[PDB]
Design an enzyme around this catalytic site. Structure first.
Site, PDB file in Angstrom:
ATOM      1  N   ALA A   1      41.659  23.779  10.674  1.00  0.00           N
ATOM      2  CA  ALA A   1      40.797  23.061  11.958  1.00  0.00           C
ATOM      3  C   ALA A   1      39.306  22.451  11.301  1.00  0.00           C
ATOM      4  O   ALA A   1      39.170  22.772   9.886  1.00  0.00           O
ATOM      5  CB  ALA A   1      40.084  24.465  12.164  1.00  0.00           C
TER       6      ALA A   1
ATOM      7  N   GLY B   1      40.690  20.461  13.249  1.00  0.00           N
ATOM      8  CA  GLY B   1      42.154  20.275  13.693  1.00  0.00           C
ATOM      9  C   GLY B   1      42.409  18.034  13.574  1.00  0.00           C
ATOM     10  O   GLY B   1      43.453  17.789  14.207  1.00  0.00           O
ATOM     11  N   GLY B   2      41.536  17.775  12.433  1.00  0.00           N
ATOM     12  CA  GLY B   2      41.969  15.856  12.768  1.00  0.00           C
ATOM     13  C   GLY B   2      42.799  15.988  12.679  1.00  0.00           C
ATOM     14  O   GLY B   2      43.844  15.107  12.874  1.00  0.00           O
TER      15      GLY B   2
ATOM     16  N   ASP C   1      45.416  33.943   6.641  1.00  0.00           N
ATOM     17  CA  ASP C   1      44.647  33.661   5.064  1.00  0.00           C
ATOM     18  C   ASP C   1      45.821  32.618   5.046  1.00  0.00           C
ATOM     19  O   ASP C   1      47.236  32.983   5.009  1.00  0.00           O
ATOM     20  CB  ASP C   1      44.466  34.950   4.332  1.00  0.00           C
ATOM     21  CG  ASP C   1      44.212  34.383   2.721  1.00  0.00           C
ATOM     22  OD1 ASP C   1      45.029  33.114   2.271  1.00  0.00           O
ATOM     23  OD2 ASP C   1      43.426  35.103   2.039  1.00  0.00           O
TER      24      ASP C   1
ATOM     25  N   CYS D   1      38.676  15.454   0.141  1.00  0.00           N
ATOM     26  CA  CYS D   1      37.544  15.136  -0.039  1.00  0.00           C
ATOM     27  C   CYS D   1      36.132  15.056  -0.708  1.00  0.00           C
ATOM     28  O   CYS D   1      35.469  15.430  -0.544  1.00  0.00           O
ATOM     29  CB  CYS D   1      37.102  14.787   1.740  1.00  0.00           C
ATOM     30  SG  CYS D   1      36.357  16.180   2.123  1.00  0.00           S
TER      31      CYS D   1
HETATM   32  N1  LIG Z   1      42.407  30.957   2.769  1.00  0.00           N
HETATM   33  C1  LIG Z   1      42.235  29.499   3.985  1.00  0.00           C
HETATM   34  N2  LIG Z   1      42.777  30.110   4.590  1.00  0.00           N
HETATM   35  C2  LIG Z   1      43.326  28.752   5.871  1.00  0.00           C
HETATM   36  N3  LIG Z   1      41.889  28.232   5.917  1.00  0.00           N
HETATM   37  C3  LIG Z   1      41.169  28.163   5.010  1.00  0.00           C
HETATM   38  C4  LIG Z   1      41.073  29.229   3.925  1.00  0.00           C
HETATM   39  N4  LIG Z   1      40.171  28.574   2.957  1.00  0.00           N
HETATM   40  C5  LIG Z   1      39.391  27.629   3.490  1.00  0.00           C
HETATM   41  N5  LIG Z   1      40.258  27.127   5.122  1.00  0.00           N
HETATM   42  C6  LIG Z   1      39.796  26.674   5.964  1.00  0.00           C
HETATM   43  O1  LIG Z   1      39.973  25.257   5.149  1.00  0.00           O
HETATM   44  C7  LIG Z   1      38.912  23.942   6.063  1.00  0.00           C
HETATM   45  C8  LIG Z   1      38.784  22.705   5.211  1.00  0.00           C
HETATM   46  C9  LIG Z   1      38.701  21.862   6.151  1.00  0.00           C
HETATM   47  N6  LIG Z   1      38.368  20.578   4.732  1.00  0.00           N
HETATM   48  C10 LIG Z   1      40.757  21.309   6.712  1.00  0.00           C
HETATM   49  C11 LIG Z   1      39.717  19.829   7.990  1.00  0.00           C
HETATM   50  C12 LIG Z   1      41.271  20.128   8.373  1.00  0.00           C
HETATM   51  N7  LIG Z   1      42.729  19.717   7.934  1.00  0.00           N
HETATM   52  C13 LIG Z   1      41.019  18.655   9.547  1.00  0.00           C
HETATM   53  O2  LIG Z   1      41.795  17.106   8.707  1.00  0.00           O
HETATM   54  O3  LIG Z   1      40.493  18.651  10.361  1.00  0.00           O
HETATM   55  C14 LIG Z   1      38.000  24.873   6.469  1.00  0.00           C
HETATM   56  O4  LIG Z   1      37.967  25.058   8.279  1.00  0.00           O
HETATM   57  C15 LIG Z   1      38.081  25.933   5.943  1.00  0.00           C
HETATM   58  O5  LIG Z   1      38.123  27.239   7.070  1.00  0.00           O
END
Ligand SMILES: Nc1ncnc2c1ncn2[C@@H]1O[C@H](C[C@@H](N)CC[C@H](N)C(=O)O)[C@@H](O)[C@H]1O
Length: 443
Positions: free
Chosen positions: A264, A266-267, A313, A385
């Site tokens: 999320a 979701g990019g 998780d 990033c």
């Molecule tokens: N233990 C976890 N399990 C699942 N998601 C996590 C966990 N820890 C952090 N996150 C999520 O990791 C995400 C980090 C973002 N950099 C993701 C960006 C995403 N990949 C995009 O391109 O839109 C956040 O939305 C957090 O809620």
């Protein structure tokens, strides 16, 4: 002449600065506040946007000034007061306001924060205004002089110097420039690039196509997304060039089973679906329910149909979706975001050191969770990033030590080598995108 801000404009940045503290990324707060206070004019939108980012960029320095005038950190004060004080200090020190603007600060700002709180806080603000306009900026320390040149805290400046050395000044220059550009990706599943470019140039939008990934466009703001035809039809999504490269590097194929371990808003997971040409399966994990609902909104609007969202998780799975079940997994790991300090300038002040190591440990346990999801022939891409070695090269050297059995697949295009050979880094001052890290791994 000088800077003239109307009453609705004064209430606008105060609300944007206030909401920017609780809504991240702060762009959403700026949008919300501007639409709330009816900032229709492009000239006002530009001026207030410029002030917005000037405050975010210099937040820590502005706060030090507030402490000198007021006597205490603005952090113990009411949120509306703190926001108003930040706005006033920034306007007084940097933007040379016209008499009308200073009048609107005195009467309309005081009244506005009173209506959001209590008459006593507006009064307290009113009592401070003259002190702010008479404040003599006095950088004494060699440390304070340094912090004012880079617009950054001393610990960060030091930490960047340990990474970039001679390039430290250029790095801070690139994250300090203004600059009104927004990076977007064209959804190939629903539109083509030239068609989008034409529709944007049909408005008064200046567009520059990326040379590294031709589906990425840089557009000159301001641009309203909730009135945009292209956005509401799911033809475009806000994404940095560096983030778009990630999905292309992992290289998912149609029909494959893919995992986006931290997905999320979701990019990248929406980009993975484009590359798989809407065929196969994507498991999208995220702990944040409120960020996941944005991903669900994007998925259906962009015509994606192969994504199964899972609000769980990501250290779980294996034993949620299976052991060696993924052809390839993307771990766009939660991180410090230090590489994004040009885009979200205030982060440079909110970041701690501690919690660099706190994020580093979480990445490792997601990384171990990722490893066990990969098929023998499969591939793992790790990205952050962040510009810190602790979250990047250090975490990969550890991964190659404990795992058995992955190896680093060498990366060259389109950016530069990382500090471990085979890894790739993007830099703001070299590439005009966010600071980014890439590590491609296969069993
Ligand atoms: N233990 C976890 N399990 C699942 N998601 C996590 C966990 N820890 C952090 N996150 C999520 O990791 C995400 C980090 C973002 N950099 C993701 C960006 C995403 N990949 C995009 O391109 O839109 C956040 O939305 C957090 O809620």
């Amino acid at each position: 002449k000088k800077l003239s801000i109307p009453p609705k404009g004064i209430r606008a940045i105060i609300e944007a600065i206030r909401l920017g503290e609780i809504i991240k990324p702060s762009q959403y707060a700026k949008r919300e506040a501007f639409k709330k206070h009816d900032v229709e004019e492009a000239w006002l939108n530009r001026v207030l946007t410029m002030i917005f980012y000037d405050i975010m960029k210099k937040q820590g320095l502005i706060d030090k000034v507030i402490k000198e005038i007021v006597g205490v950190t603005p952090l113990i004060l009411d949120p509306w007061l703190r926001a108003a004080l930040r706005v006033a200090v920034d306007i007084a020190l940097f933007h040379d306001p016209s008499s009308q603007t200073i009048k609107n600060l005195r009467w309309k700002a005081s009244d506005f924060i009173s209506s959001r709180t209590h008459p006593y806080v507006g009064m307290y603000f009113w009592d401070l205004l003259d002190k702010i306009f008479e404040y003599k900026p006095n950088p004494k320390n060699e440390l304070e002089e340094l912090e004012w040149k880079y617009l950054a805290p001393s610990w960060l400046i030091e930490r960047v110097k340990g990474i970039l050395g001679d390039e430290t000044e250029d790095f801070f220059r690139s994250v300090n420039k203004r600059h009104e550009w927004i990076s977007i990706r064209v959804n190939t599943l629903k539109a083509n690039v030239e068609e989008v470019i034409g529709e944007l140039e049909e408005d008064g939008v200046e567009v520059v196509r990326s040379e590294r990934v031709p589906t990425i466009l840089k557009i000159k703001g301001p641009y309203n997304f909730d009135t945009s035809s292209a956005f509401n039809e799911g033809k475009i999504i806000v994404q940095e060039e560096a983030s778009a490269v990630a999905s292309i590097v992992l290289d998912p194929k149609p029909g494959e089973t893919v995992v986006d371990l931290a997905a999320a808003p979701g990019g990248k997971t929406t980009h993975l679906a484009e590359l798989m040409k809407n065929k196969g399966k994507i498991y999208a994990f995220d702990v944040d329910k409120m960020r996941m609902k944005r991903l669900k909104d994007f998925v259906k609007r962009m015509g994606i149909k192969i994504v199964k969202p899972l609000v769980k998780d990501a250290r779980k799975a294996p034993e949620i979706i299976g052991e060696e079940v993924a052809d390839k997994v993307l771990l766009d790991a939660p991180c410090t975001s230090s590489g994004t300090i040009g885009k979200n300038p205030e982060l440079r002040w909110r970041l701690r050191e501690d919690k660099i190591n706190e994020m580093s440990q979480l990445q490792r346990e997601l990384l171990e969770s990722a490893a066990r999801l990969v098929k023998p022939g499969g591939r793992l891409l790790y990205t952050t990033c962040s510009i810190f070695k602790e979250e990047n090269e250090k975490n990969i050297r550890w991964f190659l030590n404990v795992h058995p059995e992955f190896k680093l697949v060498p990366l060259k295009s389109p950016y530069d080598p990382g500090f471990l050979e085979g890894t790739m880094r993007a830099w703001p001052h070299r590439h005009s995108t966010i600071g980014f890290f890439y590590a491609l791994l296969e069993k």
